[PDB]
Amino acid sequence: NAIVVDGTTFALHGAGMSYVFHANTTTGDLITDHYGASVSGALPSPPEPVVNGWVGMIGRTRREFPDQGRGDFRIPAVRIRQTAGYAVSDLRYQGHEVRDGKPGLPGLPATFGEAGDVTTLVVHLYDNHSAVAADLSYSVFPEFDAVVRSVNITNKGNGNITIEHLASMSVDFPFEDLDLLGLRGDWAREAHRMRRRVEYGVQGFGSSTGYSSHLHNPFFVLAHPSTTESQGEAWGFNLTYTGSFSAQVEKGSQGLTRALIGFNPDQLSWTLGPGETLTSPECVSVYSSDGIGGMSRKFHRLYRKHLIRSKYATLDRPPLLNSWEGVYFDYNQTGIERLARQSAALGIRLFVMDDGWFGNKYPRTSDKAGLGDWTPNPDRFPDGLEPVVERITNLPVNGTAGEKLRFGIWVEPEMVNPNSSLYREHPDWVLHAGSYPRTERRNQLVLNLALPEVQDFIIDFMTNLLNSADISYVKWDNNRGMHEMPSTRTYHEYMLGLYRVLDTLSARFPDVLWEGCASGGGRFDAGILHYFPQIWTSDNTDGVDRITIQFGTSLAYPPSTMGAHLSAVPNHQTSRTVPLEFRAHVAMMGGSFGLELDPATLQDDPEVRRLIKLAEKVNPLVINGDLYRLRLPEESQWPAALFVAEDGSQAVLFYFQVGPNVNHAAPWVRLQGLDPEARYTVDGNATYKGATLMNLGLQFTFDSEYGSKVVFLEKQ
Amino acid sequence: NAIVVDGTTFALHGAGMSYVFHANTTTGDLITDHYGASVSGALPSPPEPVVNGWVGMIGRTRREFPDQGRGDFRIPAVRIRQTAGYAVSDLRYQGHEVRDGKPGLPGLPATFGEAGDVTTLVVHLYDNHSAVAADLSYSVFPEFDAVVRSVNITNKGNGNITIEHLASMSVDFPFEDLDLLGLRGDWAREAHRMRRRVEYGVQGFGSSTGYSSHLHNPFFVLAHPSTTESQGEAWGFNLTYTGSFSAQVEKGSQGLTRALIGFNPDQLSWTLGPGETLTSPECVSVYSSDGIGGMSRKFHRLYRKHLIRSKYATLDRPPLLNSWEGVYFDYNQTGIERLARQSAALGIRLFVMDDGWFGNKYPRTSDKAGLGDWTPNPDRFPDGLEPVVERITNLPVNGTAGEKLRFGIWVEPEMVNPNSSLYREHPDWVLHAGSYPRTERRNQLVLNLALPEVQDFIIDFMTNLLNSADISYVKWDNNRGMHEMPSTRTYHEYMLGLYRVLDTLSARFPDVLWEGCASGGGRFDAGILHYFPQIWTSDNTDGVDRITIQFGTSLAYPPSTMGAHLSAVPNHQTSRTVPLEFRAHVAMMGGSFGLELDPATLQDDPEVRRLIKLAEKVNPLVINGDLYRLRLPEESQWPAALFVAEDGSQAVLFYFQVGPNVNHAAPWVRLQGLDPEARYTVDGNATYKGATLMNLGLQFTFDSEYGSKVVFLEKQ
């Protein structure tokens, strides 16, 4: 009984969430009644508001699919330029259907589930005067208090129409003070938490790169001002889409707040011919009454159970060594094998050969050539790739007894250098607008994945690459945004093309571990997580800054999803030097731990082998546990996080001291998410009751500029 | 004409400040009218308030010298236990006197000036029921907008009275929003700026250590919430005292705000026999209508001209090398001359021998023995101190053509180790209370400077030490607070003793550079500064923390006063590693630049030598210039300071980037204090108008974790 229909009243009920709206059988419009904690039985209906001035009754109600141009002066969820040239729309309720389970989304990633886990309501709207239909989908995963929404615009007329704006999700909030949380950043500093009070007017963010981007993530939280990581009410929203997007919160004149996410309107002019349909990407919505952190934990469990479809969602990731920051472009066969040998002697189970291996006539010896020609470079691999992959995958891994090293490889399929062979043959494969200059970023242009030719070029050279040697890992990079485009339609057709490609290649190679990447987290979104079980979090590999970046990213996405590598010091992006154990402890909070340096530069082998076994020990709890962000880096210089097994048997605490703490008391870190009346053994020694660890806590002191502790808890 | 008297109205006028109060003919009370920017002529009087409830008229007025116990329930400026046992006091105006110049204070440090720079009004109050006189002094330095206040209480009856509380200055503000600024800290983190809204109730701070302490400085600012370093009204208050203090700011039930500073009342129980007198220390107050930075510049120029009496107040300090961090206790004759030789090799002009040189039967080889025994250790100085100091003062200074190195020494006169000959001889000289444990801090006790025996002991061993070799610099340290006291009287009696000793010694050796110290800034107050031209700012020598520490101290005291040493890395207090040029540039903001490291551990002699020459070049501006804090380290990671010559012909700009600035724009630093129409050549290259440098500014970028720039300006 997760969806309940009485009359025109639709109720979606999770475990501790409820979402209730109804159709007004006088105006035909869908009106929101409640989105929050559980309600049941009869609900109080609001007294009718007195109407004065220009704002009519339509400007005073909470709406679910608001249009503009018939009296509502607030931001709309939809804009349609009709065939006759009006931008008016009057979509009136027509009927509905409830079904158990969740239909797929055509050509797009979506959450999925079976009849027990999820129930779906589709509501049908129709415009009599313009012959346009809109179908609104609502799915409830009741276990996670999640509501997944998406919308369809179908043109049933006889001329064309243009969708000038189409929000995936559109919720109207009652009059109450709200705070908006987002993640903002840029290259080497993605996912910085920002929190601001919602003001009369518009605030929000989006992306115009054509991808979800480093600048803003397609994610935001509305909270009461008093809401913390563990107290109070939060509403999260996540767009399942890798393209441009727009997120907007508007507190209207009357005091109700409108929140909406979907396509970036400015890159959506979607012509619909008679009989065509536009399908928005899904938006996943979570409510929590247990603070922002409760909201995150439901997201994390939902994505790990009903979004990440790869067989690695719950499997542990091998500690890897990536060759980029250790060797950059300057190597050949000889060096790659040197890195692989030192890798397996240290206990690393997977070796990744990053940029620099490909191109022939135009070799990838720098930023400036070879993207597009995806065959090994004979100057560097004279007998091909397969014999080197062969010798690398015969190296035994230290401290393992049995297992041999695995090999992975870097690719950037959507891109081409002008100085390449592919570009010389197919210069029209790239994104461009007529005769305008083809602007480069890092000397490359973007391939037009809206063309089926370009799609099959990528599908084919990756199928051939993965069948040419023993490759069990692919890092799929993407190092610039879209600039000039042959039409506004191409923004979303590129993404439909990329999804066909990612869908084919990941279904075709289910045993490859695929890592997304885009100069780090430039495409860190649920859209990519559907096909890839993990994403390179950031090119910033500095211990101190990775704590801010990993904490912010975990606001929406599960730590299982985050790649994190121990790097060399002084750090190549910050120039900051941080001790080796601090750097490692930070990386162990990523689902996929690894090294990214020349192992020749690290001289304490027993320490490194000791940190790699610790990484393997904590990796199961990071993959499958629940995260409690005990102390945020934004609030203090002692950030801390707690991973609790889903069944409470075990926990691991990461606790850091960032600044020096000169001549001063240290705080107490208090845990949460334990059993108050249970006993827990802390790091094999003392034994405390759950209530003590949660209401008193532990205190750690350091006499150093940087300090860190990884502490294990066993229940009894 | 700085003091205008009209009947019972008293007006104190400065360049842009007026301070106006009057005696109420009917009540005898001194009422404040205005403490702010200039007024003249007739002043508007407040309409009379309506009285309802328990708070009578006395609780609704602005009072100059408030008592309690006659209907004013607000915090009082004085409390006297009369001979009959009452704590009541009705001091009424009897008369006044205006004089040119300014009297000194009996036994206490105080500001000074001759006729043309300062004028003084004394108001006589007298209580006829109890025979108690009180005399309030107001002095105006018109050029600096400074009012200095102090009060004597004289017992003129036939019994004893007790002064249980006596504030040095007390102002009632009208009803208006106020912010309170102070300097808080502890060892190795002195002088952190703090700012808070003033609230209904009490707020403030003080010292219970017997000295002015690292924990709070005897200083505070009242400013409007909108007030910045360069805009708005600010009222500063500074207590010229090295002992315990209390500063309280109370917003009363009616909304007037009472500010008071003076003796700590809990450490003041002063009994006056018939005819006896108590003098409070003076309180300097500065008003500025040009922001908190304008108030500091007036404090800085007033202290340099009218407080710091040493001949070094406006003399350049020689670059010095201190042995403490390079060698600690472990050395003898041979290592001291090594350090001196190497120091002269770098261009260092003054070599200071720090702790560890003294002691005989209980040698000072560590923290645990020898304080009290101020003869040179024969195990470390077999032929005495004079032969070594002779060879040291013969070393020529490199790049100086002629000058010979000077020698300095460290002493801690007010302290004794139980393991010392002094203590076995005179065990009763230490501060103690009967048979209570003599609790130690850093293995030492405090000598009771209230006893003339102790004073004459300190004068004698310092005079014999300074006459026994060619010593031109003394570092007077003091490494613990007071604990047990033979009586409450002793808190102030100690200070009167300490000041007699500092007066005697500092006038007996006017050509020694005296530098105060107390575990860094434990006695960084106007009291010491009267006798010593510079003070060791903090034991923390980390370059990043000294920015905060030095900017903070500069809120009250001039940069010519602050000692700063370039240290080695990793830092001994923080463990931080910071680049040498950064470290060096931070230390050039203090008046006495120095080195505190073993010269053999230097990565670059040529770069050190070039940095010492740069210190000698910036020093005249730091000693005599006006400080403009352009950007505060509490507000961004780009702190900046500007020293402008009094005549505006030259300026030095210090600019810092503290953390890394990864992939992000940098701010503009905008100057101030220049002539908008003059032209100024920047670092011998470009030439810009003053308005351009002030309204647009300069921009600096960095590819590193830590950046710094020292940029010189010359009028044309």
What residues form DSSP beta bridges with A247?
A261
Residue closest to B337 by CA, chosen among B599, B111, B587: B599
Contacts of A705 in chain B (CB under 8 A): 570, 574-576
> A528: part of which helix (H) or strand (E)?
helix A526-531
Q: Among residues B588, B668, B656, which one has the least CA distance to residue B625?
A: B588
Count CA atoms closer than 13 A to B600's CA, side-chain side: 9
Contacts of A187 in chain B (CB under 8 A): 663
Reduce the secondary structure of B220-271 to three states and give it as a string.
EEEECCCCCCCCECEEEEEECCCCCCEEEEEECCCCCEEEEEECCHHHCCEE
Is B476 labelled as part of a ligand binding site?
Answer: yes
Burial of residue B341 (number of CB atoms within 10 Å: 0-12, 13-18, 19+): middle
Q: Is A539 an annotated catalytic residue? A: yes
Q: Positive or negative CA dihedral for A639, A645, A646, A649?
A: negative
Report the candidate in A469, A440, A470, A347 with the shortest Cα–Cα distance to residue A397.
Answer: A347
How far apart are alpha carbons A234 and A334 in whole angstroms?
54
Distance to chain A for B439, nearest Cα, Å: 21
Using the 8-state DSSP alphabet, how is residue A397 labeled?
P
Of A573, A662, A664, which has the smallest distance from its Cβ to B574's Cβ? A662
Active site residue A100: no
Write down how long chain A is: 716
CB contact under 8 A, B189 and A576: no
Q: Is the peptide bond prior to B570 cis by the omega test (within 30 degrees of 0)?
A: yes
Kindly state the tokens that stand for B524: 């960084």
User: Which residues of chain A make contact with B577, given a CB cutoff of 8 A?
Assistant: 577
Domains B1-297 and B298-622 share a fold: no
Q: How many C-beta atoms lie closer than 10 Å to residue B25's C-beta?
A: 10
Indicate the domain borders of chain A: 1-297, 298-622, 623-716
Nearest-angstrom CA–CA distance, B526 and B532: 10
Q: Which amino acid is located at A579 in the chain?
A: P
Pairing of strands B270-272, B687-689: unpaired
B278, two tokens: 């108590």
SS3 B403: coil
- HSE-CB at B522 with a 13 A cutoff on CA atoms is 18
The response to whether B456 counts as a known ligand-binding position is no
Whether residues A545 and B577 touch (CB distance < 8 A) is answered with no
CB burial of residue B162 (10 Å; 0-12, 13-18, 19+)? middle
CA separation for the pair B323, B342 (Å, rounded): 12
Q: Name the residue among A163, A177, A174 with its Cα closest to residue A226.
A: A177
Query: B532-556 in b/e burial notation, b at 16+ Cβ within 10 A?
Result: bbbbbbbbbbbbbbbbbbbbbbbbb
Helix (H, G, I), strand (E, B) or coil at B24: coil
Secondary structure of residue B578 in the 3-state scheme: coil
Residue type, B580: L
Cβ-defined contact of A660 to B575 (cutoff 8 Å) = yes
- Round to whole Å and give the CA distance between B520 and A250: 54
Burial of A180 (0-12, 13-18, 19+ CB in 10 A): buried
Bridge partners (DSSP) of residue B650 are B714
What Rg, from alpha-carbon coordinates, does chain B have?
Answer: 26
Mutate: best of A184, A662, A664, partner B, most B CBs <10 A: A662
Tally Cβ neighbours within 10 Å of residue A607. Answer: 13
Can you name the residues that pair with A596 across neighbouring β-strands?
A567
C-alpha to C-alpha distance for A547 and A549, rounded to whole angstroms: 5
Resolution limit in angstroms? 2.6
Q: Angle formed by the axes of helices A605-624 and A333-346, to 10°?
A: 80
Tell me how crowded residue A45 is: count the other CB atoms within 10 A of its CB.
8
Contact A169, A247 (CB under 8 A): no
Cα separation of B523 and B503, whole Å? Answer: 16
CB pairs under 8 A between A and B: 45
Rounded distance between C-alpha atoms, residue B380 and residue B10, angstroms: 64
Q: What does the block give as tokens for A172?
A: 């109207």
**Rounded Cα distance, A22 and A63, in Å:** 10
Taking the C-alpha atoms of residue A608 and residue A342, their distance in angstroms, rounded to an integer, is 12
Suggest the residue from B189, B663, B664, B702 to mutate for an interface test with chain A (most A CBs closer than 10 A). B663
**Cβ count near B92 (within 10 Å):** 17
The phi, psi pair for B466, rounded to 5°, reads -70, -20
8-state DSSP, A704: S
Identify the burial level of A670 via C-beta atoms within 10 angstroms of its C-beta, where 0-12 means exposed, 13-18 middle and 19 or more buried: middle
Residue of B542, B577, B662 with shortest CB distance to A577: B577
- Does the annotation place A477 within a ligand binding site? yes
SS3 A545: helix
Query: What residue has token string 């707020």?
Result: B203
The tokens describing A84, both together, are 């006759």
Query: Do B663 and A576 make contact, defined as CB atoms within 8 angstroms?
Result: no
Nearest by CB to residue A663, choosing from B186, B576, B660, is B186
> How many helical (H) and strand (E) elements, i.e. helices and strands, does chain A have?
12, 36
**Contact call for residues A296 and A570 (beta carbons, < 8 A):** no
DSSP letters along B134-195, please? EEEEEEEEGGGTEEEEEEEEEE-SSS-EEEEEEEEEEEEE-SS--EEEEEE--TTS--EEEE
Q: How many CB atoms lie within 10 A of CB B683?
A: 12
What are the residues facing B123 on neighbouring strands? B96, B136
Q: What is the DSSP letter of B599?
A: G
Contacts with B545 from chain A: Cβ below 8 Å: 662
**B146-155/B283-288 β-pairing:** antiparallel
Name residues whose C-beta falls within 8 Å of residue B338's C-beta, 6 or more positions apart in sequence: none
Q: Which two tokens stand for residue B171?
A: 């102002």
User: B520 CB contacts (<8 Å, ≥6 apart)?
Assistant: B187, B188, B190, B214, B536, B537, B538, B539, B540
Residues in chain B: 716
Contact list in A for residue B187 (CB cut-off 8 A) is 663
Q: Which residues of A touch B660 (CB under 8 A)?
A: 574-576
H helices present in B446-602, as ranges: 452-468, 489-508, 526-531, 543-553, 580-587
Q: Which two tokens stand for residue A361?
A: 């006539």
Residues of A in contact with B657 (CB under 8 A): none
> To the nearest whole angstrom, how far is the Cα of B398 from the nearest Cα of chain A?
35
In angstroms, the CA A384 to CA A335 distance is: 15
Task: Single out the residue of A319, A318, A317, A314 nearest to residue A624, CA to CA.
Answer: A314
Q: Residue A705, CB half-sphere, CA atoms under 13 Å: how many? A: 20
* CA–CA distances in Å: residue A294 to residues A188, A228, A287, A633: 28, 10, 9, 18
Mutation site, A187, A441, A442, A663, interface B, largest B CB count within 10 A: A663
Which residues, at least 6 apart from A480, have a Cβ–Cβ distance to it below 8 Å?
A415, A441, A442, A444, A446, A519
Experimentally determined by: X-ray
Q: Which residue type occupies B618?
A: V
User: Which of A457, A553, A632, A634 minimizes the C-alpha distance to A212?
Assistant: A553
Check whether A324 is labelled as a binding-site residue: no
Residue A487: how many CB atoms within 10 A of its CB? 11
DSSP code string of A337-353: HHHHHHHHHHT--EEEE
Q: Is B545 within any annotated ligand binding site?
A: no
Taking the C-alpha atoms of B464, B468, B474 and B476 in order, what is their torsion angle to the nearest 10 degrees?
-30
Instruction: Please give the backbone phi and psi of residue B616, each rounded to the nearest 5 degrees, phi first.
Output: -65, -25
Measured CA to CA, the distance from residue A349 to residue A280 in angstroms comes to: 41
Residue B697 Rama label (left phi>0; alpha psi -120 to 50; beta) = left
DSSP B615-660: HHHHHHHHHHSEEEEEE-TTT-S--EEEEE-TTSSEEEEEEEE-S-
Q: Taking a C-beta distance cutoff of 8 angstroms, is the pair B429, B453 a contact?
A: yes
Task: Give the residue from B634, B645, B631, B646 showing the smallest Cα distance to B709.
Answer: B631
Q: CB A665: neighbour CB atoms within 10 A? A: 8
Chain B residue whose CA is closest to A660? B574
CA distance B704 to chain A (A): 6
CATH of range B298-622; options 2.30.30.230, 3.20.20.70, 3.60.9.10, 3.40.50.300: 3.20.20.70
Contact A660/B576, CB-based, under 8 Å? yes
Contacts of A662 in chain B (CB under 8 A): 188-189, 540, 545, 573-574
Closest CA to A419 of A367, A375, A460: A367
Cα–Cα distances (Å) from B45 to A273, A699, B63, B598, in that order, read 81, 59, 15, 67
Name every chain B residue with its beta carbon within 8 A of the beta carbon of A540: 662
Please answer whether residues B645 and B301 qualify as being in contact, where contact means their C-beta atoms are separated by less than 8 angstroms.
Answer: no
Q: How far is CA B33 from CA B20, B58, B61, B199, in A?
A: 5, 15, 10, 22
What is chain B's percent helix, strand, coil content, to nearest 5? 20, 30, 50
Nearest CA in chain A to B576: A705
- Are B660 and A188 inside 8 Å of each other by CB? no
The half-sphere exposure of B170 on its side-chain side, counting CA atoms within 13 A, is: 26
Q: Give how far Cα A92 sits from Cα of A25, A131, B377, Å.
A: 9, 11, 100
Phi, psi of A559, deg, nearest 5: -45, -30
User: Does the annotation list B442 as a binding residue?
Assistant: yes
What type of residue is A491?
Answer: Y
As a whole number of angstroms, the distance between CA A302 and CA A143 comes to 9
CA proximity to A483, closest of A429, A423, A430 = A430
> CB neighbours (10 Å) of residue B129?
13
Rounded Cα–Cα distance for residues B505 and B514 (Å):
10
* Full DSSP string of B285-309: EEEESBHHHHHHHHHHHHHHHHT--
Query: Alpha-carbon torsion A525, A528, A534, A539, what sign?
Result: negative
Contact in structure between B143 and B15 (CB atoms under 8 Å): yes
Cβ pair B662:A573 closer than 8 A: yes
B532, B220 Cβ separation under 8 angstroms: no
Give CA–CA dist A67/B406, Å, rounded: 84
Q: Do B704 and A575 touch (CB under 8 A)?
A: yes
Distance from C-alpha of A215 to C-alpha of A178, rounded to nearest angstrom: 23
CB–CB contact B664 A189 (8 Å): yes
Cβ count near B114 (within 10 Å)? 10
Give the minimum alpha-carbon distance from A553 to chain B in angstroms, rounded to a whole number. 18
What is the rounded end-to-end Cα distance, in angstroms, of chain B? 39
Mention every residue, 6+ apart, whose C-beta is less than 8 A from residue B215. Answer: B184, B185, B186, B205, B207, B209
The partner residue sitting opposite A663, judged by closest CB among B187, B660, B703, is B187
Please count the CA atoms within 13 angstroms of the CA of B543 that sit on its side-chain side: 27
**Chain B residues bordering chain A (beta-carbon distance below 8 Å):** 186-189, 540, 542, 545, 570, 573-577, 660, 662-664, 703-705
Give the closest-approach CA distance of A578 to chain B in angstroms: 10
Instruction: Say yes or no for a CB contact (<8 Å) between A663 and B189.
Output: yes
CA A497, CA A481: separation in Å to the nearest integer? 16
Residue B111, C-beta contacts closer than 8 angstroms, at least 6 positions apart: B102, B118, B139, B141, B148, B240, B282, B284, B302, B306, B307
> Any residues with CB less than 8 A from the CB of B50 and at least 6 apart, and which?
none
Locus of tokens 């090294």: A595
Least Cα distance to B598 among B560, B646, B566 occurs for: B566
| Domain range B1-297, its CATH number among 2.70.98.60, 3.40.50.150, 2.40.40.20, 3.40.1180.10 | 2.70.98.60
Q: Is A517 annotated as a binding residue?
A: yes
d(CA A117, CA A109): 18
Measured distance CA(B479)–CA(B522) in Å, rounded = 8
How many whole angstroms separate alpha carbon B480 and alpha carbon B445? 8
Amino acid at B293: G
DSSP helix/strand/coil, B31: strand
Rounded to a whole number of angstroms, the distance from the CA of A607 to the nearest CA of chain B is 21
CA distance B294 to B223: 12
| CA–CA distance, B278 with A295 (Å, rounded to integer) | 66
Bond into A318 cis (ω within 30): no
